């Protein structure tokens, strides 16, 4: 029995495990329960706090992954398998993980809380890319990651009902945040310095905690990587959520809200997952069936309205995108695209891809998109059309929603830092035409290149170390700049006036101005005006 | 005769003419000025198609420029060369249908290619007698036979009651056509080759040239064409029959007139200056780069809109040279956009920009105007006065000239014509408009005509060499349908403009530079998206 691996939290005693990090040992407490299993009658319901347990709870292994769809598009392919569940699926999945330096910190250490992505229909805190040992060992950070319900289990809603109010997956995240306030000090973490960070849907989740008052007292800073609460995919109206839920009910033989939900609760988990994808209103990509709902409760109004009227004075935020946000999504539904060839497309294929990439666009709006993205000097060039299709999807879904968020937060009091990640991992298995795809900056932020057996170049290892420093400096001070270094170059705050952001790649920081300024004005100022009149 | 210069007496279909020997820097040239080509379109002939000039007896004196067609005279900036250079330089009169001929002295031995100039002035002004249209340099240095005609402008040349017999519309274009017929019949008498006639014009003159390309009866009167900063397609060069009727009857009301016959008959009783005095009161909105009486889509001279005709036309046996200047729109801003002036830097506010856009694109809906504003706004510095000023200029120049020219070059090329394109970027050292206006609309003309060759005009030595280069391109084009010098292979070649490569050249003090795409992205906005916005 090692006293460093023994901790006492409000629910009882835990025993962690000493793990090996390249530069030394770290203490890991994995699979800690933070809520009563949301099973049986608790399906679709808000999470309840975990009841106290007797004896010593074994916290040396990752717990089960929340029930979810498993990708089968490219069987055996690392590019896709790296995101698949790496533990048993089960609705009994509300557990969190804690990594800390070994021995446990002498003084209160700033805490980083990770919220994974996966379109709100997948993901797990146990994936290898979210391994917190590196950040814990090299920066002495206390890192926490929780599992939260996804898909129908976490977001199926019959707005106004008592049994399926919606947003329970976000409530799962919130309970884990509360658990950190109440118990993280026992691990040497400082509950007064909690930074949330997440990518994609995880970034959108972080944004929703920023916009939901009850969450605000649970953290102090936030990082949103390639995702936002505003935008076309992160939320749905109460009406559309009801529509998708009742349609799902119908598809599985069900059946008054109470009766419908009661019947949904009798169905095997895989039955719900089997019909999950048959409820989307149009043929599309970057659109997900069950996501956070504007309920007038967790989210008092649309994210769009909340970021326009909010006061973000005492908040520091780090936000950014990767160089090719949309490439990944094209192979999941756009005719002509495949990871196995160059994906050179025709102009006709391009106009068709646009209707799929911007599913909610009228014919006029779609034509505006085509005319804006077509390179009129080479309107029929396959390479340009392919890269344009990618850009359309990434701009519409991520880059412009991020530009929008950065601007409102900065205009309204927040301290904001922005970046564009442009380094393509030497070990990437997706083809070259996809560039730096959605999600591939994560392994660097978590410091995986520091593991010699992973085969990253020596420059990548130095790069990862730089990133871990930015992220942890940001967590510690609300500023990613190194207060030790006195010759950077400095990463300036993003402002509406100057719109400065930095490039994150192998070369030293480069300051740029305007995040797709012209193109995002198109998406954020003109298209709306188009549709609200037509 | 007997004692006069035997080299200045010539005979044309209507009679004998006596020209004048003029001095050009490098030698003498023959000039026959004020040759009548139509019966004076006065009294009962106002608003009517021109009739050929009846033969005269004796020797008609063709030694001085004739009257300028009745028109509005600009007084915005009294005494200012920038505006005065375009004002009438001879008496105003409805008796103005005369043309001019410049030829080498002595007259060419073999048939020489003919260049016919058609002046601009928004169809409401202009004259073939202005100093910038002086044909002596091209005649002397390139041995060209140059012809320029006066044609009716304003109400006199374009007021129309479509379908009527008395004011059919487009009579100013008919005056031009009559002069082209006069060249076919008589130019050989001056040593000109009727089988090699190139039309060139600028602005409304350019639009005029384009309309002759689109009107069959004019097609047999010329072989090649040059359109400088103007096109027959676009937002200002034509009006629909309904709009023309509307403007003509509103004008009639404004002067006390009112059945078309009675209305027109009453208009014919009004003093010419009364019509000019109300000419500007008939435009539908507050605007710039819009003119009251212009060519009308009559279903006769123009069988359909210029846009339809260039989309369906067969232009296989046609060579065309087309181009624009660096700052097509600047000039127009001081004539109606609040905040702009030739006497200050014209730095404007964002609010002044949004208002300028409503005036610069008068036919745009609220949604269309916002699209313009969002496209032209520099989102890194959305409030910068200098950028807003230059963006306002670009909006006007792109909408009215640059994009209509790109549209034209594209259709002509795709449909058989050989097209050459340019952008003129040299600002005359003698320009009197402020620097912020750059190379304004109309300021490439003095270079094409070779004025810098006159020592007394004070152009720099480089400008004189530059002028010579341009005269060479224009006359090579007139001679062969190709601006390139057949010999000199050293100088970079001017490639044809194609839909595939979209190549055009920069005309400035430096050697030719080939560029691709004429404001390609922005013109796609104007030529493909805005229209479609309109269909909704
Ligand atoms: C549109 C009708 N309007 C009578 C306003 C109700 C304004 C006409 C003013 N207006 C304009 C002008 C100014 C700004 C915008 C558009 C046109 C104008 C424009 C040019 N190049 C040359 C002369 C004039 C001009 C000459 C005589 C009279 N009498 C009025 C005139
Ligand atoms: C530039 O001028 C515009 C027009 O005003 C006229 O010209 C100026 C120079 C004065 O002589 C004035 O009396 C004239 O009416 C102004 O509207 C504009 O504000 C001026 N720009 C600035 C701010 O200097
Ligand atoms: C790439 O592969 C997909 C499916 O195998 C196919 O639809 C597409 O035509 C291919 N593209 C190329 C470059 O041939
Ligand atoms: C040309 O320069 C001379 C000498 O400076 C000057 O007297 C004359 O007014 C100028 N004329 C022009 C064309 O500006």
mmCIF file of C-alpha atoms and ligand atoms in Angstrom, chain A residues 334-345 349, ligand 3:
data_model
loop_
_atom_site.group_PDB
_atom_site.id
_atom_site.type_symbol
_atom_site.label_atom_id
_atom_site.label_comp_id
_atom_site.label_asym_id
_atom_site.label_seq_id
_atom_site.Cartn_x
_atom_site.Cartn_y
_atom_site.Cartn_z
ATOM 1 C CA UNK A 334 -20.004 13.895 -49.925
ATOM 2 C CA UNK A 335 -20.033 12.041 -53.276
ATOM 3 C CA UNK A 336 -16.577 12.079 -54.792
ATOM 4 C CA UNK A 337 -14.613 12.095 -51.580
ATOM 5 C CA UNK A 338 -12.578 9.227 -50.158
ATOM 6 C CA UNK A 339 -9.565 8.841 -47.922
ATOM 7 C CA UNK A 340 -8.153 6.383 -50.439
ATOM 8 C CA UNK A 341 -7.682 8.661 -53.494
ATOM 9 C CA UNK A 342 -6.961 12.356 -54.289
ATOM 10 C CA UNK A 343 -10.653 13.183 -54.171
ATOM 11 C CA UNK A 344 -10.361 15.503 -57.175
ATOM 12 C CA UNK A 345 -13.926 16.560 -57.869
ATOM 13 C CA UNK A 349 -19.863 17.422 -57.529
HETATM 14 C C1 LIG C 3 -12.328 8.090 -55.004
HETATM 15 O O1 LIG C 3 -13.000 6.914 -54.515
HETATM 16 C C2 LIG C 3 -14.447 7.032 -54.450
HETATM 17 C C3 LIG C 3 -14.982 5.696 -53.896
HETATM 18 O O2 LIG C 3 -14.039 4.628 -54.019
HETATM 19 C C4 LIG C 3 -15.040 7.359 -55.838
HETATM 20 O O3 LIG C 3 -16.429 7.661 -55.707
HETATM 21 C C5 LIG C 3 -14.323 8.545 -56.497
HETATM 22 O O4 LIG C 3 -14.746 8.647 -57.854
HETATM 23 C C6 LIG C 3 -12.794 8.378 -56.442
HETATM 24 N N1 LIG C 3 -12.143 9.571 -56.964
HETATM 25 C C7 LIG C 3 -11.144 9.461 -57.841
HETATM 26 C C8 LIG C 3 -9.952 10.409 -57.673
HETATM 27 O O5 LIG C 3 -11.150 8.630 -58.761
#
